[PDB]
Curated annotation (Swiss-Prot), chains A, B:
Residues 7-117 form the OmpA-like domain. It comes from Helicobacter pylori (strain ATCC 700392 / 26695). GO terms for biological process: bacterial-type flagellum-dependent cell motility; chemotaxis. The gene is motB. The keyword Transmembrane helix applies. It comes from the Bacteria. This is Motility protein B. Each stator complex is composed of 4 MotA and 2 MotB subunits. 2 A subunits and 1 B subunit are thought to form a single ion channel, so that each stator complex contains two channels. The chain holds residues 126 to 252 of 257 of the full protein.
Length: 133, 133
């Protein structure tokens, strides 16, 4: 439907050019939404060890990931007032952590919308019109 | 006791260098607190009209203030996992909005700690042993 922001490797919080482009589309969407809609950028990791890395927990890596994406959104014009970030650490995985490929699905940031019922449909249509030909 | 971060003028989120040095002293403090203490950075304003400004509400001004302070704390070593920011707009003044000086008191960011009872005592000492030794 709409992809989360997937990170290159398991230990990285780096935002590459492709992800920058994707964050820009999402920033563009957020600004057409009703102002009472708020955005929570959620960070997650796989279960890969954090040896050979500066981070002392997956909650840190996940926070850094989410904080970064939110900062790129702010750079594209999204209002700080509509935004927050959350770290979920290694909890709540999307796929099994059995393979490199599935592990990478877990290393992500997700966008949650906070919306009343009457605004929900506007978001739905705005999201459809952006992410379809 | 510990002062809030005060903003120079009513309509800006600009941080001067005596208060930037002060944010760095607070980031230093935060890094010495128990890992389970989280920190909420809160933005407030006075009630002066948003004439000739980019901000469309006091909530937006306060949110940009809080977010900026939070960004600087992260700059000086605070784990993003422990941080959040919140806007209160022109609600919750600490002073009446009846004089220029009283209004300046209202244009500020405050630090709120999220702590259990046993960490509460630890924060107490750290703040005492730093701000009144």
């Amino acid at each position: 439907g709409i992809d989360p922001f997937t990170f290159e490797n398991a230990t990285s919080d780096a935002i590459n050019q492709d992800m920058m482009l994707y964050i820009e589309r999402i920033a563009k969407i957020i600004q057409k939404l009703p102002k009472r809609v708020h955005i929570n950028v959620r960070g997650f990791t796989d279960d890969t060890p954090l040896v050979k890395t500066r981070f002392k927990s997956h909650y840190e890596l996940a926070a850094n990931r989410a904080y970064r994406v939110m900062k790129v959104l702010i750079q594209y014009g999204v209002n700080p007032n509509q935004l927050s970030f959350s770290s979920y650490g290694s909890t709540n995985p999307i796929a099994p952590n059995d393979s490199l490929e599935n592990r990478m699905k877990n290393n992500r940031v997700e966008i949650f919308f906070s919306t009343d019922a009457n605004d929900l449909s506007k978001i739905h249509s705005i999201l459809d019109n952006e992410f379809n030909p």
